C-alpha cells in the first residue's frame with residue numbers, strides 16, 4: 268500500500284507539493300500571465316514553505332486591488348446565498364461574520380479562521396502554496412486539517428477562477444467545516460482514503476467533486492447549492508440553478524465514473540435528495556474502499572492507528 | 575447537580591483553589607515552618623496564579639538545596655524501583671529518563687514534561703499552587719489535564735512529605751500517565767466524577783487513594799507497589815512491602831469506606847490481584863455512580879457533552 272502520514276506533523280512531508288489545473292496558457296484566464304499577480308503568489312508561496320506544524324499562520328497585508336476583489340466577491344455572493352445557498356450553509360455564515368470578521372471590507376486572516384474552527388469542530392488551517400493532489404488534501408481531512416491558501420484570485424475575473432484561491436477556501440469550504448456533522452463526515456472519508464488504492468481515491472475524489480465541490484440538493488420543493496465550488500463563484504452560482512446545466516439524480520455507481528471539467532463551469536450537476544442523503548451516500552461508498560488493514564485517528568496523540 | 579466545567583479553559587475557574595493536609599502545626603514536619611521554604615512556595619504559587627490556559631508553563635531556576643533534595647529523592651527511589659515498583663512502571667521510567675531529562679542532577683521542567691505527555695497519551699500539565707480538592711483534580715482528568723506542582727519538598731525530610739510536591743507528581747504520577755491504557759483509565763473515572771453527587775466523589779477518592787495513590791498488587795508470586803504515593807516516597811516504599819503494614823484483598827465494597835491517613839505512612843494497604851484487575855474494579859465502580867444525565871468529552875473541541 269502507498270505510504271501515508273501517521274502524524275499530523277508528517278503532513279509537511281507531502282505538504283506544499285502544489286499543482287495546477289493547467290489553465291495558465293488558457294486565453295480564457297489572462298490573469299495568470301499578470302507578472303504582478305505571479306510575484307504576489309510567489310510571496311504567499313514562501314510563507315507556506317517557511318511554515319511548519321505548530322506555529323500560528325503568519326498574518327499578511329493585502330493590496331488595494333486584492334481588497335477590492337474580496338469586496339466584490341463577498342458582497343455579490345452574500346446577496347446570492349439568500350436564494351441559492353442551502354439551509355445548513357446560510358445558518359452558519361452569520362457566525363463567521365460576527366465571530367471571525369467575514370466582511371465586505373475585511374479579508375479574514377487565516378490564523379483567526381483556524382482558531383474559530385478549532386473551537387467549533389476541531390478543524391484547523393494549514394497555509395499552502397496552491398492546489399494539492401486529491402490524495403494529500405483528502406488525507407489531511409483525517410487529522411481535521413484543511414490545507415488552505417492565502418492568495419486571492421486575479422481582480423480581472425472575480426466571478427470565477429479555476430484555482431482554489433482564498434475566496435474559495437473561506438467562502439465555500441470553511442463554513443461547512445464549522446459544522447460538527449459535516450466535520451465528522453469530512454474526516455471519515457479522509458480516513459478511508461488513507462493508504463487506499465489509487466483507483467479508489469480518484470473515484471472518491473470524483474464523488475467529492477460532484478458533492479462537496481459542486482453538489483446540488485433539493486430542500487422542500489426547491490433546489491439549492493451546497494458545493495464549495497458553487498458557493499465561492501457568484502458566476503456559476505447563478506448558472507448552476509439556471510436551465511443551462513444538465514441535472515441528474517445523485518447515484519454513486521454512476522457519479523463515481525462521471526467526467527467533469529476543471530477550467531470552466533460544470534456542464535452537469537448531480538442533485539441529491541437532500542444535504543443529508545448526500546452525506547449518507549458518500550459515507551457508505553467511502554466505507555466500501557478495500558484495503559489490507561483498518562485505521563483510526565487518535566485525537567489525543569494526533570496519530571493514525573493501523574488496525 | 576453541582577456545576578462542573580464544560581471547557582478545558584473553564585478549569586481556571588476552580589483552578590488554584592489550593593488546600594492542605596493540615597500538617598503545618600505538626601511537630602513531625604518542621605519544614606513547613608521554614609520561612610525560606612514558605613517564601614519559595616509563595617513564588618511558585620504566583621506562577622500558578624499568573625498562568626492561564628494555552629501559555630507554556632514558565633521555566634524556573636531551583637536553589638542548590640532544592641537540586642540536592644531531588645538528587646537524593648531520585649537516586650534513592652531509582653534504586654528501590656528495581657525490586658519494589660510494578661512491571662508497568664519500570665518499563666516506562668527509562669523513557670522519561672532519555673526523552674524528558676529525568677536525572678539525578680536535573681529537575682525536569684514542567685513544560686518539557688507536559689509536551690512529552692501530549693505526544694504520549696494526550697495528557698498535559700497545568701501548574702498549581704498546591705493541593706487541590708479531589709473533585710477538582712478528578713474533574714481535570716476528564717480533559718486529560720493533570721494539575722501539577724512546581725515546588726519541591728523541604729530538604730530536611732526527603733524520605734517523605736505529606737504534601738504533593740514536584741517529586742510526587744513527576745516520579746509517582748507522570749510515569750503511568752504516559753501509558754495509554756492507564757491514561758484512558760484515568761480519564762474515565764474523571765468523567766464519571768463530573769457533576770456526580772458529593773457522596774460518590776468521596777467514595778471514588780477513597781478508592782483512588784487505595785489504588786492510584788497507595789495501591790499494591792501482586793505480579794507472579796510476588797508483590798509490588800503501583801501507587802503514586804508509594805512510588806514518590808522512598809520512605810514508605812520500603813515500608814509498604816515490609817511486614818509492618820497490614821495487607822488486605824482489594825474489595826470495592828470494603829475499600830470505598832475504609833479510613834486512611836494523610837500526614838503519615840498508611841497503616842493499611844489493599845493488594846490487587848494484578849495491576850489490570852485493579853483498573854477493572856475501579857472502572858466498574860466508577861460506572862456505577864448515579865446521576866440525572868451522561869457526559870462525553872469531545873477531544874476535538876475540548877468540551878464536555880451532556881447526554
Ligand SMILES: C[C@H](O)[C@H](O)[C@H]1CNc2nc(N)[nH]c(=O)c2N1
Pocket residue numbers: 395397398399400401402404405414415416431436440472475480
Ligand atoms: C479532493 C479534491 O480534489 C479537492 O478539490 C481538493 C484538491 N486540492 C485542494 N488544494 C487546496 N489547497 N485547497 C482545496 O480546497 C483543494 N481541493
Ligand SMILES: C[C@H](O)[C@H](O)[C@H]1CNc2nc(N)[nH]c(=O)c2N1
Pocket residue numbers: 702704705706707708709711712721722723738743747779782787
Ligand atoms: C483525587 C485525590 O484526592 C488525589 O490525591 C489528588 C488530590 N489533589 C491533588 N492536587 C495536586 N496539585 N496534585 C495531586 O497529585 C493531587 N492528588
Ligand SMILES: N[C@@H](Cc1cccs1)C(=O)O
Pocket residue numbers: 426427428429430431432434435480495496497499500
Ligand atoms: N471555480 C471556483 C474555485 C474552485 C472550485 C473547485 C476547486 S477550485 C471559484 O471560482 O470559486
Ligand SMILES: N[C@@H](Cc1cccs1)C(=O)O
Pocket residue numbers: 733734735736737738739741742787802803804806807
Ligand atoms: N507522601 C508522598 C506524597 C503524597 C502522597 C499522596 C498525596 S501527596 C511522598 O512523600 O511522595
Ligand SMILES: [Fe+2]
Pocket residue numbers: 431435440480495496
Ligand atoms: Fe474545494
Ligand SMILES: [Fe+2]
Pocket residue numbers: 738742747787802803
Ligand atoms: Fe497523588
